[PDB]
Amino acid sequence: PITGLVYDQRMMLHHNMWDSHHPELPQRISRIFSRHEELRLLSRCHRIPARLATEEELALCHSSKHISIIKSSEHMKPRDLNRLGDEYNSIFISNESYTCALLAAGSCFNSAQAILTGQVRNAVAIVRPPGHHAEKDTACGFCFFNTAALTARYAQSITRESLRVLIVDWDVHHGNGTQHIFEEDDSVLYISLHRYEDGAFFPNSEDANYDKVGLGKGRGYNVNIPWNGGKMGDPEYMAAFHHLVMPIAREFAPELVLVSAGFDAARGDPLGGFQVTPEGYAHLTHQLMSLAAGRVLIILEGGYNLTSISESMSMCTSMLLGDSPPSLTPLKTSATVSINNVLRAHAPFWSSL
Ligand SMILES: O=C(NO)c1ccc(Cn2ccc3ccc(C(=O)NO)cc32)cc1
Ligand SMILES: [K+]
Ligand SMILES: [K+]
Ligand SMILES: [Zn+2]
């Protein structure tokens, strides 16, 4: 029962040349890593080396044109970096962004390999920039390549094509890119919880609604749990896991679990407006560990309150390491509406609901 950890300070180099206080801060990963050290979690883990993803690996999910353009930013002048970033929705680019994105994805590849070859049982990836908004052909929402999506396809490439991967995305935002890459796929189950507000919360698309259940062979294998009209917290996320995430996950029977673990639904995050506690995140993690013979990889996505993300992700690693889940209640009626809309939408596909 070994827990793996990947972290590389070089991922700090990606930065916003025109706003040094932009919330997607280099110090997000350094503060998380320092907290793991202070709580003596880092020393209990097997340290997994970071590496660069290759261009061929990026092609598992991304087009050659998208790869080529982000790769070209390594040599761009500031004016061109500013212009290129402005072509995307909510993106800033520095000369180091491309290599930092490659390191984020390659770090998760080595961790997935460590889990699947049996070097470790589960692992945590402290990485940036994030991934789950990136699409096959575009960058978006602070994301250049879809790290989680690439890790599922990489895991299949070193095992078998039909390896069953569950991606649970508990970042407060919908992972539009992850949904789209796998929308027609029945080997990768995508389950996202996210603030939605009738499509008015970023990324501002009705793609995130409960009635997007997948396409073709992928019908049933895309589960959107959208939140409306309420500051949601531990009881809503616990209830969503009880009624939706875990029954569906168990019937899918994943062989590997990836968590797109944004912590911008955490109490104290200005971008999320929610109040999931560190104890709540620990309970979510502990529930996922009952799947896939414990093969769970926790991947940092969003999360912008430096203290909140450090405490929340540390609680997740503590659960992975086997520590007892900490001690933690009527739901907002809006959350009941949301959960029951997902249940009605997915009853045709999941007999255990
Ligand atoms: O993925 C993320 N975090 O993990 C993420 C990605 C992109 C953005 C874009 N963005 C940046 C400032 C800002 C303000 C308001 C809205 C808004 O309200 N739109 O409706 C959006 C905004 C935010 C968060
Ligand atoms: K999400
Ligand atoms: K899918
Ligand atoms: Zn987010």
Residue numbers in the entry: 442 to 769, 773 to 797
Question: What do the authors of the reporting publication say about this deposited model?
Answer:
Histone deacetylases (HDACs) regulate the acetylation state of lysine residues of histones as well as other protein substrates, and therefore play a pivotal role in many cellular processes. Specifically targeting two or more distinct HDACs can also be beneficial, but this presents a particular challenge when those two HDACs belong to different isozyme classes with different structural requirements for efficient binding (the Zn2+‐dependent HDACs are grouped into Class I (HDACs 1,2,3,8), Class IIa (HDACs 4,5,7,9), Class IIb (HDACs 6,10) and Class IV (HDAC11)). We report the synthesis and evaluation of a class of selective multitarget agents for the inhibition of HDAC6, HDAC8, and HDAC10. Hybridization of the two inhibitor structures resulted in dihydroxamic acids with benzyl‐indole and ‐indazole core motifs.
The structure of this complex reveals that 3a binds to HDAC6 as a single conformer. The catalytic Zn2+ ion is coordinated in monodentate fashion by the hydroxamate N−O− group of 3a (average O−Zn2+ separation=2.1 Å), and the hydroxamate C=O group accepts a hydrogen bond from the Zn2+‐bound water molecule (average O−O separation=2.4 Å). The Zn2+ coordination geometry is similar to that observed for the major conformer of 3a bound to HDAC10. Also similar to the HDAC10‐3a complex, the aromatic ring of the phenylhydroxamate nestles in an aromatic crevice, here defined by F583 and F643. As observed in the HDAC10‐3a complex, the capping group is clamped down by E24 of the P23(E,A)CE motif; however, the capping group of 3a in the HDAC6 complex is oriented toward solution; the indole hydroxamate makes hydrogen bond interactions with N645 as well as R788 of a symmetry mate in the crystal lattice. Since the inhibitor capping group has a specific binding site in a pocket in the active site of HDAC10 that is not conserved in the active site of HDAC6, this feature must contribute to selectivity for binding to HDAC10.
